[PDB]
């Protein structure tokens, strides 16, 4: 009971009948698709983000190697964009997939699947 959850598929949350005031929201893709990259060598990519919310949004991403990005945290303002760098070096050859869990100041969470098929090309 206390500890032990069977497991349920994630469901896109939805706002109630009405919701006003002040809220922060960013623009993030469903997942990061990394084309055929080198296994040993490290891979990187740029992810643009434009503050869509109404007030200052504060997101804090957390990840670990081989998945690592920066700035792990930042503050975007409504009516502006930014660029986030994501570093990922698949030390092992094969298919690597993960998930970027973002943390908001208000108390929200995000899910962004990761990818980066590595090959022994070298």
Curated annotation (Swiss-Prot):
Disulfide bonds: none annotated. It is found in: Cell projection, Cilium; Cytoplasm, Cytoskeleton, Cilium axoneme; Cell projection, Cilium, Flagellum. It is linked to Ciliary dyskinesia, primary, 5: An autosomal recessive form of primary dyskinesia, a disorder characterized by abnormalities of motile cilia. Respiratory infections leading to chronic inflammation and bronchiectasis are recurrent, due to defects in the respiratory cilia; reduced fertility is often observed in male patients due to abnormalities of sperm tails. Half of the patients exhibit randomization of left-right body asymmetry and situs inversus, due to dysfunction of monocilia at the embryonic node. Required for ciliary motility. Interacts with KIF9. This is Hydrocephalus-inducing protein homolog. It comes from Homo sapiens (Human).
């Amino acid at each position: 009971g206390s500890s032990g959850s069977s497991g349920t598929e994630r469901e896109k949350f939805i706002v109630p009948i009405k919701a006003r005031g002040a809220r922060a929201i960013l623009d993030f893709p469903d997942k990061l698709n990394f084309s055929t990259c080198p296994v040993k060598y490290s891979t990187q990519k740029i992810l643009l983000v434009r503050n869509i919310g109404n007030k200052n949004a504060v997101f804090h991403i957390k990840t670990c190697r081989p998945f690592s990005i920066e700035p792990a945290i930042g503050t975007l303002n409504v009516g502006e964009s930014m660029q986030l760098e994501v570093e990922f070096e698949p030390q092992s050859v094969g298919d690597h997939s993960g998930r970027l869990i973002v943390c908001y100041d208000t108390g929200e969470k995000v899910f962004v699947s990761l990818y980066g098929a590595a090959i022994d090309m070298n």
